[PDB]
Design a protein around this ligand. Structure first.
Ligand SMILES: *[C@@H]1O[C@H](CO)[C@@H](O[C@@H]2O[C@H](CO)[C@@H](O[C@@H]3O[C@H](CO[C@H]4O[C@H](CO)[C@@H](O)[C@H](O)[C@@H]4O)[C@@H](O)[C@H](O[C@H]4O[C@H](CO)[C@@H](O)[C@H](O)[C@@H]4O)[C@@H]3O)[C@H](O)[C@H]2NC(C)=O)[C@H](O)[C@H]1NC(C)=O
Ligand SMILES: *[C@@H]1O[C@H](CO)[C@@H](O[C@@H]2O[C@H](CO)[C@@H](O[C@@H]3O[C@H](CO)[C@@H](O)[C@H](O)[C@@H]3O)[C@H](O)[C@H]2NC(C)=O)[C@H](O)[C@H]1NC(C)=O
Ligand SMILES: *[C@@H]1O[C@H](CO)[C@@H](O[C@@H]2O[C@H](CO)[C@@H](O[C@@H]3O[C@H](CO)[C@@H](O)[C@H](O)[C@@H]3O)[C@H](O)[C@H]2NC(C)=O)[C@H](O)[C@H]1NC(C)=O
Ligand SMILES: *[C@@H]1O[C@H](CO)[C@@H](O[C@@H]2O[C@H](CO)[C@@H](O[C@@H]3O[C@H](CO)[C@@H](O)[C@H](O)[C@@H]3O)[C@H](O)[C@H]2NC(C)=O)[C@H](O)[C@H]1NC(C)=O
Ligand SMILES: *[C@@H]1O[C@H](CO)[C@@H](O[C@@H]2O[C@H](CO)[C@@H](O[C@@H]3O[C@H](CO)[C@@H](O)[C@H](O)[C@@H]3O)[C@H](O)[C@H]2NC(C)=O)[C@H](O)[C@H]1NC(C)=O
Ligand SMILES: *[C@@H]1O[C@H](CO)[C@@H](O[C@@H]2O[C@H](CO)[C@@H](O[C@@H]3O[C@H](CO)[C@@H](O)[C@H](O)[C@@H]3O)[C@H](O)[C@H]2NC(C)=O)[C@H](O)[C@H]1NC(C)=O
Ligand SMILES: *[C@@H]1O[C@H](CO)[C@@H](O[C@@H]2O[C@H](CO)[C@@H](O)[C@H](O)[C@H]2NC(C)=O)[C@H](O)[C@H]1NC(C)=O
Ligand SMILES: *[C@@H]1O[C@H](CO)[C@@H](O[C@@H]2O[C@H](CO)[C@@H](O)[C@H](O)[C@H]2NC(C)=O)[C@H](O)[C@H]1NC(C)=O
Ligand SMILES: *[C@@H]1O[C@H](CO)[C@@H](O)[C@H](O)[C@H]1NC(C)=O
Ligand SMILES: *[C@@H]1O[C@H](CO)[C@@H](O)[C@H](O)[C@H]1NC(C)=O
Ligand SMILES: *[C@@H]1O[C@H](CO)[C@@H](O)[C@H](O)[C@H]1NC(C)=O
Ligand SMILES: *[C@@H]1O[C@H](CO)[C@@H](O)[C@H](O)[C@H]1NC(C)=O
Ligand SMILES: *[C@@H]1O[C@H](CO)[C@@H](O)[C@H](O)[C@H]1NC(C)=O
Ligand SMILES: *[C@@H]1O[C@H](CO)[C@@H](O)[C@H](O)[C@H]1NC(C)=O
Ligand SMILES: *[C@@H]1O[C@H](CO)[C@@H](O)[C@H](O)[C@H]1NC(C)=O
Ligand SMILES: *[C@@H]1O[C@H](CO)[C@@H](O)[C@H](O)[C@H]1NC(C)=O
Ligand SMILES: *[C@@H]1O[C@H](CO)[C@@H](O)[C@H](O)[C@H]1NC(C)=O
Ligand SMILES: *[C@@H]1O[C@H](CO)[C@@H](O)[C@H](O)[C@H]1NC(C)=O
Ligand SMILES: *[C@@H]1O[C@H](CO)[C@@H](O)[C@H](O)[C@H]1NC(C)=O
Ligand SMILES: *[C@@H]1O[C@H](CO)[C@@H](O)[C@H](O)[C@H]1NC(C)=O
Ligand SMILES: *[C@@H]1O[C@H](CO)[C@@H](O)[C@H](O)[C@H]1NC(C)=O
Ligand SMILES: *[C@@H]1O[C@H](CO)[C@@H](O)[C@H](O)[C@H]1NC(C)=O
Ligand SMILES: *[C@@H]1O[C@H](CO)[C@@H](O)[C@H](O)[C@H]1NC(C)=O
Ligand SMILES: *[C@@H]1O[C@H](CO)[C@@H](O)[C@H](O)[C@H]1NC(C)=O
Ligand SMILES: *[C@@H]1O[C@H](CO)[C@@H](O)[C@H](O)[C@H]1NC(C)=O
Ligand SMILES: *[C@@H]1O[C@H](CO)[C@@H](O)[C@H](O)[C@H]1NC(C)=O
Ligand SMILES: *[C@@H]1O[C@H](CO)[C@@H](O)[C@H](O)[C@H]1NC(C)=O
Ligand SMILES: *[C@@H]1O[C@H](CO)[C@@H](O)[C@H](O)[C@H]1NC(C)=O
Ligand SMILES: *[C@@H]1O[C@H](CO)[C@@H](O)[C@H](O)[C@H]1NC(C)=O
Ligand SMILES: *[C@@H]1O[C@H](CO)[C@@H](O)[C@H](O)[C@H]1NC(C)=O
Lengths: 112, 125, 446, 131, 131, 131, 112, 48
């Protein structure tokens, strides 16, 4: 089973400064066809999940450009240029290559 | 595949008309770029081309036999025949019917694709 | 039933072809230009293909020839802006160095003095410099001259270009692709069970060696023996190791550099007076690791010639200094080490380091060129050299039906073998997207 | 995401697959076709790539397919070339093996297509000229 | 001669005009796309222009518009990409501003067009196989 | 084989033949259109040949005949350009003479063809807009 | 009239070594269009002839690869890379350029 | 006879034959070649 391990577990922050979240996989996500499969999700308090970025570094339509990501192999990170007060909530890093599908334990963001 | 087969009498007396017919199956005589020949294999003297018929109906006879060979066609039943008058003892040979290749406007194609089976005609009483 | 032919564009069909690949690098002076190489891809893609097999066959691929030509082009392009040493051919008066000279180094260095021109054509200057015994001949204190004076005049390597072998990546052009064999036990020839397509090849070190391959890519899981025709003793044998053996080389002489203005804007970097003690240059290698490596090579080499037979190792036969001694330019110093101490043992069925001497030379021609040499300027300070050994180039000693004591012998000449040991996992192919096949589709007559 | 349905693969990724399955990836192969001495060498490589692409496009243009990855022609198949079953080729043979088998008969099909196109063009012009 | 009727403008003269009026002058832009070191410089520029033109032609070739300037497609336009009126785009905007706004979604549209054309080719071939 | 029927001839070998008879050999002429100093010369020649072919294909692309050697157009022939019967041209004249006679009016015909295609393109798009 | 002449008249050989036949013409067979029109034929005892090679060097479909030919202008040669025991019979060379069509006298091949 | 303007005496006249004539030229002197090294890797082949 491809297990995902995020870090840090908790990231206390304040508005107007950058933030970073890291996601690591136990197995390489580079498929035989030369493509990577990783997606970043967001979930507010009591709300349903929402896909933020896809295919490692492909920004979804309708999500603000403040969110960004990059990486390859087994090391990937999510970088937020400028965080706002409405960015609180859990963050997940999913993979769609190895069966069964798995997601990280979850990283929470809250005001310092 | 295409098959050729000649038909006619194997014995003819001397000094009169001689007629042979060669049927065609598997292909149409009105093909866009193909010709139909009549070749005879005489013993010792070698092969000899009596004449041919083009897809347009035009006939062509060799100079040494232009005054004795005649070719006709009948597109309704997909076959062609040859008429030969003033036969002699020297005409005894195996008569073949074959189809060669015409040079198309775009490309050039040569060679006789298929041959018949051959019928020996004896000119003697 | 009726079948109609149709034409398809974009099929994966391909065929062998010859093409001139272009170099690529990180695009970060050195002897290798690197300015003609476009920047490498930030993240090269490797596509592994399933259920396909290709007939790989080295010793005939144009990749090695193209690489050889490229190395020649960069090497020639790096010597043109440098100064030509044409007025150096003069009558040299030399004398042996007797200041703390050791028994082994005795007569190696010769203190020479000669008349040399200056920036003004109306005057000359008297200077002196040190030269090795291998770069001077006697004319019949005594008179001497340079070895290249009676052959051809050549330029000196510029001091700004370093001899560091940075990696280079060869990439196929548009409409072509290079295949890679992912098999861990791939033989020098035959069909590769697992073929994979790649955009650009891995970084190949353009190192220079004559007997022992160094700074190369090691084997994936075990020692591999490569040879076009193992039964033919006249064909070289290539062996690749799985673990490396370190070697430490050094030049303890703390020599200095001296600039001699031989003309307007031209200066000759001669060897200055040696300060401190003088000793012979040499290299070291662990005896335990070398013994284990040799044992593994014997074990892998015996299955090709039989278990009963015993193989033997002997030193070089003879010939030019380039082939009879291992050479490799490191620290801007060309070495020539006597490898007779490495191949001195037998292998019968069923204090902790080895030291070998080396000689330095300044007139290096390289390859098989006689009309164009090169003068290596001296390097100030002490030179230390640590290196990784990856492979060797052996040669069989033709023998009768002895069926025993198979005597092997190190020695390589052409530089193509060095790159062959690195490019054996690649082959360039040409794709043909146009294809033809039948089906039931007719044509809509209008 | 990979699954039990379709698969993406990569450039020349269907070389080991059958013709029927490899015919779905015709676009990926087609979209990837496009110191003075070194400048000459680089320009030579680029020019050669352009000539090859232009030659392929010209061959397609002479036939009745101006531009499309899959097209049909109005000439029947001759068993003499292969004689193999229909389903046995698409579902049990790859493109490389089929190419190797038809390699000795490509020039004949290439000439037949040109002949049929010329005849069709003149017939179409004559048919349209009766207005 | 100039008048109250139609105007001719020049090469890229319709840049300031609206999209509707600029769409009538698509032919002028499309028809103008075609010391040893100096020779290398000139050949490099020529090959670059040829490669760019062939790139655009290849992109049009992959789709069903291999030989026409104006062509329709089957994929619908998702409102999220623009959510703007049809009349306001053609009669109250220029190509430069529209290109600036749609630049963030060009790759998605190109991929959708390519996939749709490939699927349409497979469907047409399958339907034609019946006849 | 040569006979009373058709004749193969050779590349540019039907120049003396009439227009009606030479119009059937368009494919043969179309298919044959494709030390540092010497490299520059050969590269210049190759680039010029490719540019010429690309220009011809571009001209055909602008018109509605981008993928066919023989096509039809909607703009008629004004008598002022040739004022000669139809039979006397195809059955009594060659391409060299017809080309020399129309050489002074080729540019006007080219402009008319381009304008006609542009108008038909917009008319067809407007008509298809109803769907 | 363009007549064809073959040589040697007889070719007695044994299975194990190659074979060669030559055919010449009185007139040049290189037509004004730049294409030769010579063909090779094989005829068995009491059977219809078969076209082996066409256009000088074109191995007809369904003919073994053991046969080959070459030539240009007025000299042509038929060579067999590997002869077997079933290659016994007459060989005819003919031209389809001049009128009337002509064929060689016919050289017979037989086991020594 | 080939000429751009036969009436113009200032223009060259070219004549082509239909049958050739043979000319035998020779250098009867049995000279020898001598090599003189005029520098490093350079030599001048003098007349011996
Ligand atoms: C096989 O691979 C090995 C690597 O293991 C190579 O070993 C390298 O050899 C080169 C010389 O060929 C070494 O480079 C020299 O190192 C000297 C020591 O300096 C040390 O400290 C400085 C601090 O800045 C480091 O930058 C440096 O890397 C060392 O760690 C330097 O003094 C030398 O600089 C002089 O020469 C250069 C040009 O080469 C000039 O630009 C400088 O101004 C100065 O004059 C030089 O950098 C290198 O350190 C070795 N690497 C290791 C890990 O030991 C082998 O050369 C290689 N090939 C072969 C054939 O074996
Ligand atoms: C390499 O070869 C293997 C073996 O042929 C390929 O696996 C095969 O993939 C095809 C799909 O194209 C399978 O066909 C389908 O299988 C399902 C199974 O339920 C069946 O329901 C369908 O009707 C159809 O038969 C085929 O079974 C499968 N073979 C196996 C698993 O043994 C593989 O795709 C090849 N890979 C490449 C890159 O060519
Ligand atoms: C397409 O044509 C090529 C030639 O252009 C054919 O290749 C040839 O194939 C034959 C076998 O059919 C090879 O013959 C060899 O014979 C020796 C001796 O008997 C035998 O030991 C070999 O194993 C081999 O069978 C021949 O070398 C080979 N190449 C050439 C240049 O002739 C090919 O077979 C043809 N393919 C089809 C489908 O017709
Ligand atoms: C630059 O922008 C100006 C607008 O600021 C353009 O002028 C406009 O040109 C259009 C042409 O269709 C005019 O529309 C016409 O208006 C008259 C009067 O209402 C009407 O009868 C016609 O049927 C048509 O609708 C528009 O009025 C006019 N606006 C102004 C303020 O003059 C100008 O053409 C643009 N130039 C370029 C090169 O883009
Ligand atoms: C080169 O010029 C000669 C002389 O004009 C051409 O020969 C002539 O070709 C024409 C056109 O095919 C022939 O006209 C037709 O002749 C047939 C009977 O063969 C008749 O049924 C038609 O109604 C029409 O009259 C003409 O007879 C023929 N011969 C002469 C003496 O004029 C030749 O074809 C030209 N070749 C090339 C390559 O241009
Ligand atoms: C197409 O245009 C070209 C060039 O504009 C025309 O060529 C020219 O035609 C005229 C005749 O209209 C030639 O004039 C000659 O003048 C002499 C002296 O008066 C007279 O003896 C001749 O009989 C002839 O009239 C002129 O030399 C010729 N070339 C040039 C370079 O001007 C051509 O006639 C036009 N074709 C058509 C169909 O309009
Ligand atoms: C090589 O020879 C030169 C020339 O004699 C030596 O240079 C002189 O050495 C002496 C003794 O050390 C000094 O007193 C002089 O001043 C030096 N220079 C000149 C211009 O005479 C040089 O030392 C010798 N080097 C070696 C290693 O023997
Ligand atoms: C450098 O040049 C000087 C000047 O020509 C040479 O000195 C001459 O040497 C010869 C031969 O020993 C004597 O006959 C002359 O009398 C010397 N002349 C002078 C002015 O000293 C000298 O030999 C040359 N070589 C070296 C190594 O210094
Ligand atoms: C100087 O060295 C040479 C070798 O190059 C040697 O032959 C000679 O005897 C030596 N002379 C002295 C005095 O040591
Ligand atoms: C140059 O001199 C050396 C030493 O005397 C000799 O070995 C070599 O052969 C000479 N080369 C030539 C070209 O004479
Ligand atoms: C590689 O394969 C060839 C062909 O079978 C064989 O002759 C050769 O000995 C093999 N080499 C090794 C090292 O297995
Ligand atoms: C290899 O060498 C042997 C002689 O040792 C020779 O007989 C053979 O033909 C050569 N080639 C191959 C492919 O075995
Ligand atoms: C090599 O080994 C000898 C052993 O005595 C030692 O003296 C020398 O310093 C060593 N050299 C290096 C470079 O390790
Ligand atoms: C070379 O020097 C390094 C210095 O750390 C040492 O670890 C290594 O053992 C030495 N190797 C030999 C063969 O002396
Ligand atoms: C290698 O090491 C083994 C250890 O037992 C020893 O027996 C053998 O003689 C050694 N070989 C050499 C060549 O030193
Ligand atoms: C040599 O010995 C190995 C065992 O170490 C064995 O597997 C191999 O078969 C032997 N060689 C032969 C030719 O029997
Ligand atoms: C090493 O090779 C040389 C070749 O000239 C030879 O003279 C020498 O004896 C060899 N060394 C040993 C230990 O045999
Ligand atoms: C290399 O060393 C051995 C050690 O015995 C010696 O015999 C041999 O002569 C040396 N090689 C040279 C070229 O001097
Ligand atoms: C090789 O080993 C033998 C063992 O007796 C020794 O005498 C000889 O000196 C050695 N030679 C070298 C070059 O190490
Ligand atoms: C060489 O000697 C000089 C003496 O001043 C010293 O400064 C320098 O460090 C020495 N070289 C090395 C590499 O230690
Ligand atoms: C040499 O080999 C060691 C052991 O594999 C490795 O750690 C080191 O990086 C290598 N150095 C070079 C320059 O390849
Ligand atoms: C084979 O080619 C011939 C050419 O005339 C064609 O008529 C026939 O239909 C083709 N094969 C079949 C049976 O479709
Ligand atoms: C296909 O080939 C197989 C193998 O000979 C045969 O049994 C079968 O009847 C053929 N036809 C079809 C329609 O499967
Ligand atoms: C929105 O995009 C989807 C693709 O997921 C498409 O199916 C749908 O038709 C689009 N909406 C409209 C209104 O076209
Ligand atoms: C165009 O957009 C405006 C908003 O500015 C809106 O009021 C108007 O109704 C829209 N036009 C149509 C036809 O919906
Ligand atoms: C050809 O045109 C001329 C002049 O226009 C006319 O006199 C003649 O009758 C025409 N011929 C035919 C057959 O129409
Ligand atoms: C060539 O022909 C022209 C025109 O008849 C004539 O004036 C000229 O004199 C001829 N050339 C020669 C060299 O006679
Ligand atoms: C030839 O020369 C004569 C004078 O000899 C001159 O009148 C005439 O113009 C020249 N040119 C031609 C074409 O005759
Ligand atoms: C030329 O003729 C003269 C006549 O005396 C003769 O001596 C000489 O040898 C001849 N030269 C040649 C090259 O024929
Ligand atoms: C020229 O002189 C050389 C000198 O050896 C001699 O061999 C040769 O025969 C002479 N030539 C003639 C033609 O006598």
């Amino acid at each position: 089973d491809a297990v995902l391990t995020q870090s840090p577990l908790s990231l206390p922050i304040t508005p107007g400064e950058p933030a970073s979240i890291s996601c690591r996989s136990s197995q390489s996500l580079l498929h035989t066809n030369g493509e990577t499969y990783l997606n970043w999700y967001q979930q507010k308090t009591g709300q349903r999940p929402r896909l933020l970025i896809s295919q490692v570094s492909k920004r979804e339509i309708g999500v603000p450009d403040r969110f960004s990501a990059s990486g390859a192999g087994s090391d990937f990170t999510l970088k937020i240029s400028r965080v706002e007060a409405e960015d609180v909530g859990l963050y997940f890093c999913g993979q769609g290559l190895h069966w069964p599908r798995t997601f990280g334990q979850g990283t929470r963001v809250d005001i310092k | 595949q295409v098959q050729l087969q000649e038909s006619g009498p194997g014995l003819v007396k001397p000094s009169e008309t001689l007629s042979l017919t060669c049927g065609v199956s598997g292909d149409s005589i009105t093909r866009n770029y193909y010709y139909w020949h009549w070749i005879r294999q005489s013993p010792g003297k070698g092969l000899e081309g009596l004449g041919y018929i083009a897809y347009t109906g035009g006939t062509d006879y060799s100079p040494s036999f232009k005054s004795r060979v005649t070719i006709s066609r009948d597109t309704s039943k997909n076959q062609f025949s040859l008429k030969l008058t003033s036969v002699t003892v020297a005409d005894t040979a195996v008569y073949f019917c074959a189809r060669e290749r015409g040079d198309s406007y775009i490309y050039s194609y040569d060679g006789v694709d298929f041959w018949g089976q051959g019928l020996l005609v004896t000119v003697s009483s | 039933e009726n079948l109609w032919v149709t034409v398809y564009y974009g099929v994966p069909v391909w065929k062998d072809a010859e093409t001139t690949l272009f170099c690529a690098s990180d695009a970060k002076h050195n002897v290798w230009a690197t300015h003609a190489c476009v920047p490498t891809d930030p993240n090269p893609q490797e596509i592994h293909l399933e259920n396909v097999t290709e007939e790989f066959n080295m010793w005939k691929n144009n990749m090695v020839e193209q690489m050889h030509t490229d190395i020649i082009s960069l090497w020639d392009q790096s010597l043109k802006p440098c100064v030509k040493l044409t007025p150096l051919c003069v009558t040299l008066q030399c004398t042996n160095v007797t200041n703390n000279i050791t028994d082994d180094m005795r007569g190696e260095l010769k203190n020479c003095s000669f008349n040399m021109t200056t920036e003004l054509r109306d005057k000359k200057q008297k200077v002196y410099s040190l030269f090795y015994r291998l770069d001077v001949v006697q004319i019949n204190n005594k008179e001497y001259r340079l070895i290249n004076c009676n052959t051809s005049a050549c330029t000196q390597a510029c001091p700004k270009v370093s001899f560091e072998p940075i990696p280079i990546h060869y990439c196929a052009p548009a409409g072509f692709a290079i295949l890679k064999c992912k098999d861990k036990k791939f033989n020098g020839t035959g069909p590769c069970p697992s073929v994979s397509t790649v955009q650009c090849t891995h970084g190949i070190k353009p190192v220079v060696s004559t007997q022992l391959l160094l700074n190369g890519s090691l084997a994936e899981e075990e020692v591999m023996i490569r040879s076009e025709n193992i039964t033919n003793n006249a064909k070289n044998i290539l062996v690749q190791f799985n673990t490396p053996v370190q070697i430490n080389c050094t030049r303890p002489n703390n020599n200095t550099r001296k600039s001699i203005r031989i003309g307007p804007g031209q200066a000759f970097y001669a060897t200055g007076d040696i300060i401190g003690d003088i000793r012979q240059a040499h290299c070291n290698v662990s005896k335990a690791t070398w013994n284990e490596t040799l044992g593994k090579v014997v074990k892998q080499l015996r299955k090709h010639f039989g278990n009963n037979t015993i193989i033997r190792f002997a030193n070089s036969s003879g010939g030019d200094l380039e082939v009879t001694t291992h050479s490799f330019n490191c620290g801007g110093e060309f070495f020539y080490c006597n490898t007779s101490g490495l191949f001195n043992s037998t292998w019968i069925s069923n204090n902790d380091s080895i030291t070998l001497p080396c000689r330095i030379k300044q007139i290096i021609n390289m390859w098989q060129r006689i009309g164009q040499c090169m003068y290596a300027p001296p390097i100030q300070g002490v030179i230390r050299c640590v290196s990784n050994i990856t492979g060797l180039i052996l040669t069989r000693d033709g023998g009768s039906t002895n069926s025993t004591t198979e005597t092997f012998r190190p020695g390589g000449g052409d530089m193509r073998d060095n790159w062959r040991s690195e490019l054996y996992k690649y082959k360039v192919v040409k794709i043909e997207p146009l294809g033809v096949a039948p089906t039931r589709c007719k044509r809509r007559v209008v | 995401a990979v699954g039990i349905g379709a698969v993406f693969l990569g450039f020349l990724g269907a070389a080991g697959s059958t013709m029927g399955a490899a015919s779905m990836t015709l676009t990926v192969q087609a979209r990837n076709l496009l110191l003075t001495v070194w400048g000459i060498k680089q320009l030579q490589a680029r020019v050669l790539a352009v000539e090859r692409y232009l030659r392929d496009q010209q061959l397609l243009g002479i036939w009745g397919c101006s531009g499309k990855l899959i097209c049909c022609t109005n000439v029947p198949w001759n068993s003499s070339w292969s004689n193999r079953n229909l389903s046995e080729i698409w579902d049990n043979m790859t493109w490389l093996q089929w190419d190797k088998e038809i390699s000795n008969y490509t020039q004949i099909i290439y000439g037949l297509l040109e002949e049929s196109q010329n005849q069709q063009e003149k017939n179409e012009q004559d048919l349209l000229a009766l207005d």
